[PDB]
Design a protein around this ligand. Sequence first.
Ligand SMILES: CN(C)C1CN(c2nc3c(F)c(-c4cc(O)cc5ccccc45)c(Cl)cc3c3c2ncn3[C@H]2[C@H]3CN[C@@H]2C3)C1
Ligand SMILES: Nc1nc2c(ncn2[C@@H]2O[C@H](COP(=O)(O)OP(=O)(O)O)[C@@H](O)[C@H]2O)c(=O)[nH]1
Ligand SMILES: [Mg+2]
Length: 170
Amino acid sequence: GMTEYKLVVVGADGVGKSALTIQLIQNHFVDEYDPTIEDSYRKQVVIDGETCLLDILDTAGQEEYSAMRDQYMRTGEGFLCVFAINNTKSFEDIHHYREQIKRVKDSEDVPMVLVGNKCDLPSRTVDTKQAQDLARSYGIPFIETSAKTRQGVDDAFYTLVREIRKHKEK
Ligand SMILES: CN(C)C1CN(c2nc3c(F)c(-c4cc(O)cc5ccccc45)c(Cl)cc3c3c2ncn3[C@H]2[C@H]3CN[C@@H]2C3)C1
Ligand SMILES: Nc1nc2c(ncn2[C@@H]2O[C@H](COP(=O)(O)OP(=O)(O)O)[C@@H](O)[C@H]2O)c(=O)[nH]1
Ligand SMILES: [Mg+2]
């Protein structure tokens, strides 16, 4: 049938996972969306001429490591790894998310994009170069976004779909 892509948005609390997801799905900026709610949403889009379905898992809740969690995360075909440019701790957390993704996928090569969100803010602690260097070390794209203004949002998601397509051709 129509190609579906299962995308999972990961990262620390407060980085803008929900705001990014809601911009893609519902085309507006939502402030203070319940931080605890993990949910998924589908949207039909055309990317490079392909009509496809994006199923997006917007992660939330406590740090916990069950068999059920591992099984659910393994359903993801590609991962947005999100930090906020004003939050160094959120950047430092990326390594952990990448390692957990590789663990559950049982692969060194999982489609992923590094996303630096909140690029509309003046209060930046993570420079563009630090993030580009990390992404280069992982062999993945880096995209700066603002869920507030919608800068980079489509690019982030569509780049992840392109990473999935490249993986399928290997
Ligand atoms: C050592 N802690 C202080 C760090 C904070 N962090 C978190 N790791 C999480 C994690 F690895 C998984 C995790 C477990 C697992 O079974 C398999 C996974 C596969 C891929 C990615 C994460 C997985 C899940 Cl489900 C949640 C994690 C998490 C952490 N801090 C907050 N959380 C929650 C909020 C913000 N991110 C999520 C929503 C490590
Ligand atoms: N200025 C700004 N605020 C943002 C942006 N994305 C999210 N926020 C705000 O940051 C907070 C956390 O966002 P949220 O989407 O709940 O993050 P999540 O915990 O990762 O789901 C909220 O107050 C949002 O309004 C962004 O790109 N720019
Ligand atoms: Mg959220």
